[PDB]
Amino acid sequence: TPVPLPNSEQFYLENDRGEPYLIQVSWPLHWEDKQTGRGPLPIIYIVDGNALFLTATEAAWRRAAASHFAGGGIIVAIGYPLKGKLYDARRRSFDLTPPTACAPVGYGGADVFLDFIENSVRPAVQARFPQVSLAREALYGHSYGGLLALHALFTRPQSFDCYIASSPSIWWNSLCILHEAKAFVETKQSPSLMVSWGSWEQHPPRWADELLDHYEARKRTAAELRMADNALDLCAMLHGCSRLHALIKTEYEGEDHTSVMSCSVSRGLTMFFEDWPFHQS
Amino acid sequence: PTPVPLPNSEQFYLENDRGEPYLIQVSWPLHWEDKQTGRGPLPIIYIVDGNALFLTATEAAWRRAAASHFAGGGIIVAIGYPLKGKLYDARRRSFDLTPPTACAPVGYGGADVFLDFIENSVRPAVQARFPQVSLAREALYGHSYGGLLALHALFTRPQSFDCYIASSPSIWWNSLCILHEAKAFVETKQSPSLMVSWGSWEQHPPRWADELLDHYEARKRTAAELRMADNALDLCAMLHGCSRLHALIKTEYEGEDHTSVMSCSVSRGLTMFFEDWPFHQS
């Protein structure tokens, strides 16, 4: 017998270009149905939805037993029609990267995707919960998704209340995203930003029985991606900025680029659902 | 809109030697066409309070497919209860996860019944669903009372599993009665491994925004009584250097509370068991 998923649903939406998206939604587990939810609730939108929906859903459900639980929120995972894999490399390359003059073909569709989230996904989800009003909205993404979250903050800060950038791919075009950050701070209720990374991303330890050639290759890749220091450079630029209410930065000790996803999505939704508004930075 | 399916997974029901029902949820690597793709040795992790952790363990295992240290993954087995609208069965787990003692209240002390169920019913049942798969090694994961179960299994039946993963173990329970078993374990004469973890906010919780001082002091008092970090550190100290334990990995997760640490500990537990085995001698 297959495993049923309670208090959740999925449906397909097409963007204005006719490209399909899998929208997966879940809500607090104790609810008899969607209509039992009344009043203001927070909502989190998670890009690369197929990779993270289940963990976000279940982590949110685990909060019901926690002392600091406030009522929870709605999880929305924005993904792709997939079988046997968690990512759509072609689709996400366009959807999650900002437009640049030097970007290769199939990149630079972040604003098209952000428009799709605001104009199609958000109303579609709102229509599933007519009694519920949206108290606040968070955008979560990891890697290229984290780059998207930062791009959204710097170019359309009013779009979401909270931006959660897990291990953001600042390396993809550091000149681009850091120029956008510089333009953001130098320009005249502010949103909040959570930035995180794993401590093994830039400084990976050697595995047991790992050959030296293989390890030096991993170390060189890690140095080029520069995950921790690019994130710290960005957070330094944003320090003392009036256009940001709070900036929370977190290095997860002992986590790599993949493993940190469990930590960051769980803490991201938990803090957004239970610790809002954040303390002023 | 439709219900959300879970691919490369299944569930079935088994009952213990007392006729009590259990929900067994199983998942396998996402790229597999189905269960028959797997051949040769695979690691397997058994997760108690299965309803609360199956999806996170499943998806975290699937996320490893993109990681550099991926080595084919393994099988996730969540051992839970027939439940609707909640993740825990407080009454059932109170019996199943606590060890027998003379002064334990009614409804506690059924850990050995449950461990027998896992070894004699769950393990063969899972082995039957993957006939071509050899079980290379087996881990037992549990959180809170589940962590107490994992420690009890190590101390009284160390041969049962290769790895024991005790997430925020309730060592405090019944006047620290697990410490008698730990003492008996070290003093008597391939050794298994132990992973112990806890969140840094468990014993030392920070104050919430808009929380009254009286409410916060009550939380600090409860935290001081449970003594999560120091009881775990006290236990690890007596176990370190023991000949009957191959490795002892201890982890304090900074900024995690008793609930939030579950995401971290289950994810790291399965990942290390699947990818970093054998552990270094500790």
Swiss-Prot record, chain A:
Location, primary (coarse class): cytoplasm
Documented EC number(s): 3.1.-.-
Cytoplasm among keywords: yes
GO BP, sorted A to Z: siderophore-dependent iron import into cell
UniProt keyword list: Cytoplasm, Hydrolase
Induction details: Expression is induced during iron deprivation.
Record-linked Pfam families: Esterase
Catalyzed reaction equations: triacetylfusarinine C + 3 H2O = 3 N-acetylfusarinine + Fe(3+)
Keyword Cytoplasm among record annotations: yes
Top-level lineage group: Eukaryota
Places the protein is found: Cytoplasm
GO molecular function: hydrolase activity, acting on ester bonds
pH dependence (record): Optimum pH is 6.0-7.0.
One GO cellular component, as annotated: cytoplasm
Temperature dependence: Optimum temperature is 25 to 37 degrees Celsius.
Known role: Displays specific triacetylfusarinine C (TAFC) esterase activity but does not hydrolyze fusarinine C, which has the same core structure as TAFC. Hydrolysis optimizes but is not essential for TAFC-mediated iron uptake. Both extra- and intracellular siderophores have been shown to be crucial for the virulence. Subsequent to chelation of iron and uptake, FsC and TAFC are hydrolyzed and the iron is transferred to the metabolism or to the intracellular siderophore ferricrocin (FC) for transport and storage of iron.
Protein family according to the UniProt entry: Belongs to the esterase D family.
Domain notes per entry: Ser-169 seems to provide a hub for substrate coordination, potentially playing a decisive role in recognition and selectivity.
Protein's UniProt name: Siderophore triacetylfusarinine C esterase
Organism: Aspergillus fumigatus (strain ATCC MYA-4609 / CBS 101355 / FGSC A1100 / Af293)
Gene: estB
